[PDB]
PDB file of C-alpha atoms and ligand atoms in Angstrom:
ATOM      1  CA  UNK A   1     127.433  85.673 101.904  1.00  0.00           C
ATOM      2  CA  UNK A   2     124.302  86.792 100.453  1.00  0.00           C
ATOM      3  CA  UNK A   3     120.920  85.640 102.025  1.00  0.00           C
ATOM      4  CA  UNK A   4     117.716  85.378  99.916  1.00  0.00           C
ATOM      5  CA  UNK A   5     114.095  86.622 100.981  1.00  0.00           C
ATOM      6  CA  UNK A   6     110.986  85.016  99.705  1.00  0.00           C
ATOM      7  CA  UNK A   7     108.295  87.394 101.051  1.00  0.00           C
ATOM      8  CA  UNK A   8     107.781  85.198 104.769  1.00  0.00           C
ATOM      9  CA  UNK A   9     111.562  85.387 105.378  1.00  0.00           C
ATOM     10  CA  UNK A  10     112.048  87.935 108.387  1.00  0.00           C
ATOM     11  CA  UNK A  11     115.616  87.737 111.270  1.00  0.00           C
ATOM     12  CA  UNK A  12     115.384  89.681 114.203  1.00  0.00           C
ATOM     13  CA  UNK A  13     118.623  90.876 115.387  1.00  0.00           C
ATOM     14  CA  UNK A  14     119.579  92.792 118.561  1.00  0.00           C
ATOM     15  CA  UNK A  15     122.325  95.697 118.996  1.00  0.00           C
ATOM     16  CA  UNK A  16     125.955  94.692 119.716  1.00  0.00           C
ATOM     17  CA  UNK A  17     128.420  96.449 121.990  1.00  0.00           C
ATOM     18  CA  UNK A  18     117.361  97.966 128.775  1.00  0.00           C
ATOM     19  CA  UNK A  19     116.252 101.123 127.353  1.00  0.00           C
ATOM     20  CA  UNK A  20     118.560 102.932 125.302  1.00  0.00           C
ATOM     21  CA  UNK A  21     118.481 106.467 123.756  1.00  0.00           C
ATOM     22  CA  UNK A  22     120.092 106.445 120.627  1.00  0.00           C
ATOM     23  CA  UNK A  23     121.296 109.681 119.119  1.00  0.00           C
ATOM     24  CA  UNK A  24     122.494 108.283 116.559  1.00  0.00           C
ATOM     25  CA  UNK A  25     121.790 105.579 113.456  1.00  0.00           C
ATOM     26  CA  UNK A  26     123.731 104.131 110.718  1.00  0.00           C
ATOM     27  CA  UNK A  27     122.836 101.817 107.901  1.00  0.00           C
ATOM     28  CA  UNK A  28     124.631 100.055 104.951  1.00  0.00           C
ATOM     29  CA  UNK A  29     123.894  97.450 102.855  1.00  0.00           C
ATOM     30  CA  UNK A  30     123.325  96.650  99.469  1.00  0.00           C
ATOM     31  CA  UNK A  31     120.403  94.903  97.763  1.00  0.00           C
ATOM     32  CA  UNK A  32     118.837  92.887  94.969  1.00  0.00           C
ATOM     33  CA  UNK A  33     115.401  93.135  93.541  1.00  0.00           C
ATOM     34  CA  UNK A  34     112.739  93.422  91.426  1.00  0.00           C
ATOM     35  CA  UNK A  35     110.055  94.027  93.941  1.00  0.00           C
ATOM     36  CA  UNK A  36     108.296  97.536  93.618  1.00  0.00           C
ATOM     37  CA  UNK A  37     107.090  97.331  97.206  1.00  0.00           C
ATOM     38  CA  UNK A  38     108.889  95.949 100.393  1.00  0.00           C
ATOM     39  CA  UNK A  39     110.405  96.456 104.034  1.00  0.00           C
ATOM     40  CA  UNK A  40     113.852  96.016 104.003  1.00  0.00           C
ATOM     41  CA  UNK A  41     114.770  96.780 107.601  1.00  0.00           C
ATOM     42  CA  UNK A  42     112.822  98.512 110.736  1.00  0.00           C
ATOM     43  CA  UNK A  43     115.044  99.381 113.660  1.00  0.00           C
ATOM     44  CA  UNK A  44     112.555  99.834 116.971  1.00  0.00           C
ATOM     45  CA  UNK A  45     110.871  98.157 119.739  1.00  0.00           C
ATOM     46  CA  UNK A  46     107.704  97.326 117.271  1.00  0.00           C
ATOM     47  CA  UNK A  47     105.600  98.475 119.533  1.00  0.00           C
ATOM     48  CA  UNK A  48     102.107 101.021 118.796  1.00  0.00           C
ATOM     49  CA  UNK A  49     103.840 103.489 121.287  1.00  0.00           C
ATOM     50  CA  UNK A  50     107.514 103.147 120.033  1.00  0.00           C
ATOM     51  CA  UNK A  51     109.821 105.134 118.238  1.00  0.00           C
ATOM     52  CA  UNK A  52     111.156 104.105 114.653  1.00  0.00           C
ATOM     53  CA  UNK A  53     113.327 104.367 111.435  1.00  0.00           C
ATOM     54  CA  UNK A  54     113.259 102.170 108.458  1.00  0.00           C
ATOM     55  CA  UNK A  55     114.131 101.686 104.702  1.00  0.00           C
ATOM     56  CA  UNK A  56     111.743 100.122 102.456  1.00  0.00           C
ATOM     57  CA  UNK A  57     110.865 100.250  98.785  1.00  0.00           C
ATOM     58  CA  UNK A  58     107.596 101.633  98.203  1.00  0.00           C
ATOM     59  CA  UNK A  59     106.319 102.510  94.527  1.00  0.00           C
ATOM     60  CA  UNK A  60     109.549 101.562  93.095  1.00  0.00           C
ATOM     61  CA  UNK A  61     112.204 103.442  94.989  1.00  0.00           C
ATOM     62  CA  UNK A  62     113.917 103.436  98.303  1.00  0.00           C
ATOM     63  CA  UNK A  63     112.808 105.543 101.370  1.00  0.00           C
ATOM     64  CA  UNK A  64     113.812 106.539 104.310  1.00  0.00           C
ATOM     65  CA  UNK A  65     111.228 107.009 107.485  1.00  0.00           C
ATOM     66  CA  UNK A  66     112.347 107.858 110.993  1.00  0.00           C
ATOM     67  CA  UNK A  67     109.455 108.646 113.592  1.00  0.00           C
ATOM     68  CA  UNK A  68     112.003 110.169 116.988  1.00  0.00           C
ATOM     69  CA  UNK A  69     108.823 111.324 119.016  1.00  0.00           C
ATOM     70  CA  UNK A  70     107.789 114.872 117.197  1.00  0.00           C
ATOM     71  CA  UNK A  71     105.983 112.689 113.816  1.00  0.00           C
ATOM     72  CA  UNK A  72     107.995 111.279 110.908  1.00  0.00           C
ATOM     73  CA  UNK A  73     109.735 112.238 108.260  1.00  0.00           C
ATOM     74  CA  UNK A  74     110.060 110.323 105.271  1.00  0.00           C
ATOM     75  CA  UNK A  75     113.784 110.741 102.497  1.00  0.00           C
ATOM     76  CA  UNK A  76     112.818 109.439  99.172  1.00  0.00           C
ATOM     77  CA  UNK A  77     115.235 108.262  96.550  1.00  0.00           C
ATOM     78  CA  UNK A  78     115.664 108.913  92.858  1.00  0.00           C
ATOM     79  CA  UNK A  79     116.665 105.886  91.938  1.00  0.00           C
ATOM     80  CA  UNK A  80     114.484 103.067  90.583  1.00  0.00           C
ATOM     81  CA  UNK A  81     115.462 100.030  92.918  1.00  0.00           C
ATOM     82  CA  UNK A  82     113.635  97.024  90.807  1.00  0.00           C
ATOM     83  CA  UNK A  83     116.306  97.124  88.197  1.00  0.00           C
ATOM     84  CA  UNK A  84     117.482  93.232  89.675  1.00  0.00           C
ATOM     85  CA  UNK A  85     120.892  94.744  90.229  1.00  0.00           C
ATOM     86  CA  UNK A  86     122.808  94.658  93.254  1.00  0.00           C
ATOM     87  CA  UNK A  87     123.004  98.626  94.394  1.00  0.00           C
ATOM     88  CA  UNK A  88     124.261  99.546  97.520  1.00  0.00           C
ATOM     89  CA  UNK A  89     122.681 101.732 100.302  1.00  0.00           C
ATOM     90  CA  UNK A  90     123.967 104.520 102.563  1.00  0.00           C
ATOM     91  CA  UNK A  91     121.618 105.907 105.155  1.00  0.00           C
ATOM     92  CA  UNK A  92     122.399 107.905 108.128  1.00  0.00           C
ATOM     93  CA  UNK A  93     120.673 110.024 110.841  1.00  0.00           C
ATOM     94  CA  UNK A  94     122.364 112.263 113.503  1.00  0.00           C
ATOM     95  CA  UNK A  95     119.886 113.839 115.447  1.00  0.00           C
ATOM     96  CA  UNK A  96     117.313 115.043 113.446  1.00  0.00           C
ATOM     97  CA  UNK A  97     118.748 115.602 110.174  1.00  0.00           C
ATOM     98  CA  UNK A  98     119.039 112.539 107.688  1.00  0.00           C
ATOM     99  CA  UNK A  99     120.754 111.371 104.391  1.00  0.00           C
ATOM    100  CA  UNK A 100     119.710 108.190 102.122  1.00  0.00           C
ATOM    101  CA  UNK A 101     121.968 107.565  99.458  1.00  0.00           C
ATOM    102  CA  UNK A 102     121.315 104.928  96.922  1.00  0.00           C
ATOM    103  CA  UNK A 103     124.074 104.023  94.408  1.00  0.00           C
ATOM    104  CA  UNK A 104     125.793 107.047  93.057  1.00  0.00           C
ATOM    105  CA  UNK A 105     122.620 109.778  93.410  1.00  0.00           C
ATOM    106  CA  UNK A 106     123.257 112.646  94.891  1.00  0.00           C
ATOM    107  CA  UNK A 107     122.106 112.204  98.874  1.00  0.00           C
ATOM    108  CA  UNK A 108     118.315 113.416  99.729  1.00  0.00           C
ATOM    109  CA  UNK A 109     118.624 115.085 103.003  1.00  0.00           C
ATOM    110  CA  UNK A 110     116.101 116.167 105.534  1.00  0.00           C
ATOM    111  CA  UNK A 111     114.811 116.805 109.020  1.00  0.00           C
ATOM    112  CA  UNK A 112     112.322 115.009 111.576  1.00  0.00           C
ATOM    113  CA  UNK A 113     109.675 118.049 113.102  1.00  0.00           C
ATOM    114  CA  UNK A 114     111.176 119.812 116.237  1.00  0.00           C
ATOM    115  CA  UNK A 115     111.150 118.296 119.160  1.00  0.00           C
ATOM    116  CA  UNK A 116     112.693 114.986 119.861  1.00  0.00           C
ATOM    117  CA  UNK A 117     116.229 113.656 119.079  1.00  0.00           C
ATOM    118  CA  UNK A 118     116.776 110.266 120.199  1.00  0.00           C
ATOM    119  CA  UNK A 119     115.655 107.398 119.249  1.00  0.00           C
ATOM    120  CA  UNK A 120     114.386 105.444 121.887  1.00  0.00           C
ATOM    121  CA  UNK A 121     114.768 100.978 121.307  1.00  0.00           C
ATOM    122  CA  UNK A 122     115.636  98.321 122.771  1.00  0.00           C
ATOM    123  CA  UNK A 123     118.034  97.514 120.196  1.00  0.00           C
ATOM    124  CA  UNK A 124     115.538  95.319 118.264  1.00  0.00           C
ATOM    125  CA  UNK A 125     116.484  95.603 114.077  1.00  0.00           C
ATOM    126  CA  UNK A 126     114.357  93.675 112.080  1.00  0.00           C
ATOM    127  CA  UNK A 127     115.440  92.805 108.201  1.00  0.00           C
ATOM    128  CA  UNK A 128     112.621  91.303 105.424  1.00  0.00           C
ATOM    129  CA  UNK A 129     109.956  91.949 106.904  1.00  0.00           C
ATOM    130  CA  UNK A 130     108.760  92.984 111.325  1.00  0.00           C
ATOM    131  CA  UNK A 131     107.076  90.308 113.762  1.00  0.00           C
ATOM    132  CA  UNK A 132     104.630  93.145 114.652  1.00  0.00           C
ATOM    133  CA  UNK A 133     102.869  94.183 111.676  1.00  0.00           C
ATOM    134  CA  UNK A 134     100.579  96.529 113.265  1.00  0.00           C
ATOM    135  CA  UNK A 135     100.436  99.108 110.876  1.00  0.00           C
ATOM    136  CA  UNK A 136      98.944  97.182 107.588  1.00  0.00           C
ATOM    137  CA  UNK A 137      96.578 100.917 107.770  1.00  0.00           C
ATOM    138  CA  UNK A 138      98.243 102.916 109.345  1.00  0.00           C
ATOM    139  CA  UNK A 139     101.729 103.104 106.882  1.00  0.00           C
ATOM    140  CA  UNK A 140     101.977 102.816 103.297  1.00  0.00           C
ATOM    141  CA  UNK A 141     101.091  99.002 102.062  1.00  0.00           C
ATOM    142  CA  UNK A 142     104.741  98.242 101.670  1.00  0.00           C
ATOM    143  CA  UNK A 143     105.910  98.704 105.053  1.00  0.00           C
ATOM    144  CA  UNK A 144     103.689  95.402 105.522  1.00  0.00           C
ATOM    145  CA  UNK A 145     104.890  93.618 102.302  1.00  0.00           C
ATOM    146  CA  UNK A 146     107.426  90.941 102.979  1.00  0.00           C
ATOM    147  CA  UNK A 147     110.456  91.764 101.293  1.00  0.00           C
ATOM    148  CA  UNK A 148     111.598  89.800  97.870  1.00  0.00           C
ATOM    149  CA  UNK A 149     115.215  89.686  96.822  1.00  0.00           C
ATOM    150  CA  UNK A 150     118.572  89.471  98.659  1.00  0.00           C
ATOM    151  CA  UNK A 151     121.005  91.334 100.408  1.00  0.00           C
ATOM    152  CA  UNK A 152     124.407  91.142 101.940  1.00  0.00           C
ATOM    153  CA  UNK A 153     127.341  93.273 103.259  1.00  0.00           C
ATOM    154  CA  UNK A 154     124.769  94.939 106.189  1.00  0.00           C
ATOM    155  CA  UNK A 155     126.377  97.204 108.573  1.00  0.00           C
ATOM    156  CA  UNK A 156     124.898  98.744 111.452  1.00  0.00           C
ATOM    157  CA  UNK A 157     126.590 101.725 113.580  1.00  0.00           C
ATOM    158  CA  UNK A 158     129.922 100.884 112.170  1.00  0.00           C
ATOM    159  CA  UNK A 159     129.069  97.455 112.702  1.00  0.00           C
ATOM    160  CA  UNK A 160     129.288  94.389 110.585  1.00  0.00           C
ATOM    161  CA  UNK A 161     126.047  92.440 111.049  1.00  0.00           C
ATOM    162  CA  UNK A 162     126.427  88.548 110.444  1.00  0.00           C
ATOM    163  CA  UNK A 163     122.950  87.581 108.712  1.00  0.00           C
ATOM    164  CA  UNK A 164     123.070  83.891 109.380  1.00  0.00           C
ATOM    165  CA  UNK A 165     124.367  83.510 113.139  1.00  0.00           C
ATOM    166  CA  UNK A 166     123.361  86.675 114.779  1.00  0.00           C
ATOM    167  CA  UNK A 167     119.914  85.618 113.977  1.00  0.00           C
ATOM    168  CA  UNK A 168     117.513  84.935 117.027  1.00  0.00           C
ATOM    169  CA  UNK A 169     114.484  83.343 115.484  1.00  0.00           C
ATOM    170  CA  UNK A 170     116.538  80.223 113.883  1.00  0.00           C
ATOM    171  CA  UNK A 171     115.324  81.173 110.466  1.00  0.00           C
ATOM    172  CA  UNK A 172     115.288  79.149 107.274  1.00  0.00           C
ATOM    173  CA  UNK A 173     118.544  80.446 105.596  1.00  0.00           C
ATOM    174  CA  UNK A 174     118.313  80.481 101.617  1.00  0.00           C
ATOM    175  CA  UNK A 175     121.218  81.581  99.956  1.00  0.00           C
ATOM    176  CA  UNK A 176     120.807  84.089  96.872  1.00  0.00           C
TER     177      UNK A 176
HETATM  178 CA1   CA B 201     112.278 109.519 121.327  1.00  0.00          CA
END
């Protein structure tokens, strides 16, 4: 089941099986596009004061951004993502250290600044685009770009997120 994004199309979703401190975060999915900017997904409260780590295609390629506390770090890909082929994405963070994988590259790794470790959410994950846009200056352009194309197969901490039903805004659900 693949679900289609037309730039004003964004689901918020909350964890599965408060204020949690997450260790840990795990992402797959794959995608289609020909957008050279975009947010794909933001995990975090939304909040000016809260914690983050998203995926979003800025200038062409997919990156990875995680701010834990201690400042971000961003995980760029090599890959150009606008090709309007489905390619899948791998991205993982354990503590500090990160991976972003996208199709078949070999995986860009890196580390937040020391300090803090977990993420701290309420287990909000937003996909297409975030309610709370408050950073149209303060992030690259794209992170505030509604997202154009489709994706499918999303899976969150081992996971298996259900686009259509899980969704808590009752969105308007276009296929791809
Ligand atoms: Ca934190």
């Amino acid at each position: 089941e693949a679900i289609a994004f037309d730039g004003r199309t964004y689901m918020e979703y909350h964890n599965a099986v408060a204020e949690k401190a997450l260790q840990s975060n795990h992402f797959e999915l794959s995608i289609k596009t020909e957008a050279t900017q975009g947010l794909i997904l933001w995990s975090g409260k939304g909040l000016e004061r809260s914690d983050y780590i998203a995926l979003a295609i800025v200038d062409g390629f997919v990156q990875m951004m995680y701010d834990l506390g201690s400042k971000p770090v961003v995980l760029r890909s090599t890959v150009p993502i606008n090709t309007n082929h489905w390619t899948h994405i791998k991205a993982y963070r354990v503590q500090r250290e990160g991976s972003l994988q996208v199709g078949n590259e070999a995986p860009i790794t890196g580390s937040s600044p020391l300090g803090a470790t977990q993420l701290d959410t309420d287990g909000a994950l937003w996909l297409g685009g975030m309610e709370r846009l408050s950073v149209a200056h303060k992030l690259p352009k794209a992170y505030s770009t509604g997202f154009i194309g489709c994706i499918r197969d999303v899976i969150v901490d081992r996971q298996e997120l259900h686009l259509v039903e899980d969704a808590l805004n009752n969105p308007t659900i276009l296929h791809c």
